[PDB]
Amino acid sequence: MEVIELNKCTSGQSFEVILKPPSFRDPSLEEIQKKLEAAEERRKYQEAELLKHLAE
Amino acid sequence: MRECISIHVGQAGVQIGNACWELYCLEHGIQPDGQMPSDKTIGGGDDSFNTFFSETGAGKHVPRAVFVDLEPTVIDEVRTGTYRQLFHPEQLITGKEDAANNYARGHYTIGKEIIDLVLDRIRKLADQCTGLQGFLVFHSFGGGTGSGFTSLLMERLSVDYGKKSKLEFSIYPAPQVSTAVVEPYNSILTTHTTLEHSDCAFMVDNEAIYDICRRNLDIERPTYTNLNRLISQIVSSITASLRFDGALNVDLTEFQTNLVPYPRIHFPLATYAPVISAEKAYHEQLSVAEITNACFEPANQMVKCDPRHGKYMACCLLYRGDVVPKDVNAAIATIKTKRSIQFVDWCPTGFKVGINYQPPTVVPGGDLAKVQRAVCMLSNTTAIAEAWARLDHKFDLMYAKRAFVHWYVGEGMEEGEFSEAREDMAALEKDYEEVGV
Amino acid sequence: MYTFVVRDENSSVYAEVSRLLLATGQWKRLRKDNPRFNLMLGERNRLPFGRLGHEPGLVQLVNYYRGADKLCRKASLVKLIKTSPELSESCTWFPESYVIYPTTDEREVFLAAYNRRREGREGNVWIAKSSGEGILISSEASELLDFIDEQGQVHVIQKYLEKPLLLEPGHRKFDIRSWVLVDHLYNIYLYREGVLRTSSEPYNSANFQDKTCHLTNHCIQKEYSKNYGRYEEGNEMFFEEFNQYLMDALNTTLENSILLQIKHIIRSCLMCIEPAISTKHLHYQSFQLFGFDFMVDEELKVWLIEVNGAPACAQKLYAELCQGIVDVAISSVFPLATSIFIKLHHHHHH
Amino acid sequence: MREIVHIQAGQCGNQIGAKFWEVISDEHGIDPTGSYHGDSDLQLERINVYYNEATGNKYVPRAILVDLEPGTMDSVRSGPFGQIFRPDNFVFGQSGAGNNWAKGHYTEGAELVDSVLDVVRKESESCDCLQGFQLTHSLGGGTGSGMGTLLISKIREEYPDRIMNTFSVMPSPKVSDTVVEPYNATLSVHQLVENTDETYCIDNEALYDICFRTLKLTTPTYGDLNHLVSATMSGVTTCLRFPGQLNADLRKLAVNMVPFPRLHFFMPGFAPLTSRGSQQYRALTVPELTQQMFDSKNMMAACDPRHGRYLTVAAIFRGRMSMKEVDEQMLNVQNKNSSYFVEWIPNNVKTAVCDIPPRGLKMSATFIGNSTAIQELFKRISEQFTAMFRRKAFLHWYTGEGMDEMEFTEAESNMNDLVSEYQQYQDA
């Protein structure tokens, strides 16, 4: 059971204890604003289909 | 020194934010007006606590904090509350109408109208920073805002600040205190959309916290105040290394190299001991051995699951109070012989230990008793996939009938995002199963 | 009114337990996927243990111990016994055994102790098995080493007990099956009625490929073995009769000659895996019924063959045992408005 | 998500709508002048949901009173709380609607609808954040049924992103003004299934049976029926009006209660059942509240919950009692009767609690069920409709106002479709 990289200071201590070693597209501003606009389009479509039906 | 910006989204994020900043102030001896007597470098500095607080000429210590809610009630309580002086009005951002428990309404509809303002108020704090490490993001899985806006915010923070680290504090949905019936839908949608934008995420099951409060604090019907003060203790343990002199988990990148070797499997289990009622007249104080041993009881975990039927990829112990390396090594050595602690063939079977000698600080008139030593264990175990299995099942039951889907499609979302989000989760359950069996 | 669900329709034992539970009028049965159960009588494969104990206002019990397959699958049982300090490699009640894969593996270490039993001139015959569905017993193992470098799964190569105890009249073989119930408190309850599954064909030392006088499975004795039901019905000797035989024929009792060794192996096996499977501080509770299968050799030494995690009972005993599972495993947790079992407990000071 | 705009239409709409404003004004400490003489602060924390603040720190209902005849509305002015209401919010024609849906929807009602929409607009513009609308009406007359559904249609056109909520009183041969009620109701339900987010089905059949069988009243009046209505309306609006751990709005109610947009017809329940005046003095225990509120006999919609399955449930406990006893009992009902709650909506029962009890009771439970058993209400009215429609009986009253048989056949069809959909999810 080996105790290693023991660092001490006024506030406390830290260390690692080892027993066994190993048994061995984040999309653009553009692509986002298209997803948000495509959704708003479907929302404006669905609202137009309601106001068309109500106009009937 | 490198600054960390905290972001509190929705009711869960905001109330837990209050709980943490209250505690941080008590720990660093910052008063409600924002004055820190102990701080003798007036008008600035690069101390360890400046990671979380900036300073003004008048010697005022101000959180590197953004609160965001799509509805004003909860942030209005911060604005008029005990810590009103502490915060810059521009850090407290509210809309007029909330996301009505609907991921799609928080993300697409009401999201879009406020995202650019939020990112502007986030950019104002990033500009008061000599070397931004990145972000701590507090939210519910369950809320429309917590789920839906958080995932939009995270996508953009990746774009505007690509080099910076992003940690999550995430409240996983529990029926006993949940408000909505569609929380499984919100949970999966936001996990899917957020997964590649998050380096490390600490999930807290309201179920685990509720039962710790019932069982160990003798509280019949735990409130959010009860749950939140307990959660804030555990968050304080996890963040203490960013705010205090030490050599373990010193910057946000270290959380990832120490706890997350596989980037997708980035959900470390928090275990915390001891939790002791303040109204308990006689309490015989618990040893280094007893509290390290308590880190291997499921009843002390932030998520109820069984680490015995999984494998470990990393395990940190963060001690607060009268602890010294010898007691930890004796404790650890006893515990190997008694308990099933199997690591993956390709990791060292080891612990990383951090001791801060200041015992835990409890809020005056809180439910938690002073203790001379506490520990928070952060283990990345495959057993946590139990939480994903439960949640995915609930999701499959509802989605099989398309129950409530129309509320999401009505906000401009395609039925297809549901099955995509659920495929990612099927893939995630499989990654965990490969690593751990 | 306690609630239960049934997710293993083919379970002889739990079919009968669901029946006895209904017949009390204090247990109703829910639909398979109704999550609001007190009791799960669960499937055999991929039982979703991770969904147990997260239903507020319901104490939940399941009839399986998560991790108990370590004891109940051939290859893992051998790894458990060889790697657990509390049952050393020296362990005197398990036949020398090696795990062998079709082309980790022990094959190199298998030949070192095997090729000392060429030099030794010791009756060096083995058996190989999976986890009569493809069993082989060869002297040298030109066949065995090759036989299943051929078929699907991993296999165990296990010492063959050349010199077994001989029931007379018959000059024949048997295995003993004991039923053990582990309750939620990890009480270990041996059922007082065991059974000797018997061969009906005299045991033959020279012709091994004749899998009839060597293999004692209830299935095999109906198909291949023609003297089925000759001495006892049907290749099933019970404990009164076997005790009587041991008294008449060898002057001992079942208790002294055999059962002390069975009680020792059962409590030794289950106390080993207790820290891995116990549900003491868990959010759901487990019980499980195991079938332990023993061989007695001719010096009256008991050997463990395998543990069965999903065992069937013998026809006459169903009534009694199943009532006992209810009294001890179910009614202990969910109470209503001469014990059948022997409790295995020992606290020797040293 | 603050302001609700309330509308009451026709005789029943206004008699029930008035008793609502009486009961709710007493609970929030408001007197018939608008002056607050209360004592708690939970009363005024969300007063703005139902009330506008006027000159003198006075409270005026955000309420619009609509009728095609002056009768009932002159009876509201005359009534106890008549003076509370903004006088400009009284909109009335003079002709009446003669229990005729067609007159309400197409002839007499069209003449008056634009006036109503002007007063709706004056209240909506003044709103910091409009949640939407609640309407009180019968489905069996002409004004509340036919004009009320015409309003709902116009209001959706002009406010399509706001919630529409109705308290819709269903007709019954046991309490029956005219033979044509099944006609008026079936035409109205068609409108309701298209153009509302959530509808409280208040069944005059149920209100009669509770008055006769349970409350032991031999000759039940509209007053006895309207006592049960005013108690339920208080009940189901608690979490909109009072601060608790659940601060609900009409949208969150809709999202959580309605899994399929057409299945938004709620079966409300109340415990304990009181006949006005004589109120017994034995406070009810939480176990008792829980058993009664879920009992068929306590349902305001004449359906058997055991002939269907609960898609979703909302339950309001009012008074000072153990939070823990409430969670225990609520979990006992579900775990003890789990067959009657769809397995494919996990955790489908939600419970709120409020310290302020209604006038005259120490403790009360209000039940809101989206049960598939509500089909029984709709099948009842379909059978009554077909009995007449097979002989085109009484149709001349409608063709005389420009309507075609076609429109009746379309409405019969939508309602029978609605019944098939309830049936669909009862056998999942």
Ligand SMILES: Nc1nc2c(ncn2[C@@H]2O[C@H](COP(=O)(O)OP(=O)(O)OP(=O)(O)O)[C@@H](O)[C@H]2O)c(=O)[nH]1
């Ligand atoms: N631990 C904890 N959970 C909370 C708290 N507030 C809400 N939750 C949980 O969060 C979920 C509901 O999400 P909220 O955060 O209230 O929702 P929101 O993000 O404000 O979103 P909307 O109101 O839907 O726009 C449920 O599972 C609640 O139990 C809190 O203070 N603490």
Ligand SMILES: Nc1ncnc2c1ncn2[C@@H]1O[C@H](COP(=O)(O)OP(=O)(O)CP(=O)(O)O)[C@@H](O)[C@H]1O
């Ligand atoms: N090492 C050994 N020595 C002698 N006989 C053995 C043996 N191993 C197995 N046998 C014979 O084979 C039978 C058991 O085989 P095995 O242990 O694979 O059972 P099984 O799993 O196929 C059916 P069950 O689950 O009821 O035991 C015994 O009854 C015995 O006759």
Ligand SMILES: Nc1nc2c(ncn2[C@@H]2O[C@H](COP(=O)(O)OP(=O)(O)O)[C@@H](O)[C@H]2O)c(=O)[nH]1
């Ligand atoms: N519960 C209840 N039902 C009513 C009341 N008044 C009328 N009804 C019912 O309402 C229907 C008649 O509608 P009514 O409102 O009088 O017609 P309108 O004035 O044209 O809208 C019938 O089904 C009556 O039984 C009432 O005050 N309470």
Ligand SMILES: COc1ccc2c(c1)NC(=O)CN2c1nc(Cl)nc2cccnc12
């Ligand atoms: C079935 O799940 C639910 C049922 C009703 C509700 C919810 C969930 N969650 C909400 O926020 C709104 N809601 C409720 N809304 C209203 Cl106005 N009232 C209630 C009374 C009791 C319970 N719930 C509600």
Ligand SMILES: [Ca+2]
């Ligand atoms: Ca300073």
Ligand SMILES: [Ca+2]
């Ligand atoms: Ca990234």
Ligand SMILES: [Ca+2]
């Ligand atoms: Ca005219």
Ligand SMILES: [Cl-]
């Ligand atoms: Cl960057």
Ligand SMILES: [Mg+2]
């Ligand atoms: Mg919210």
Ligand SMILES: [Mg+2]
């Ligand atoms: Mg009338």
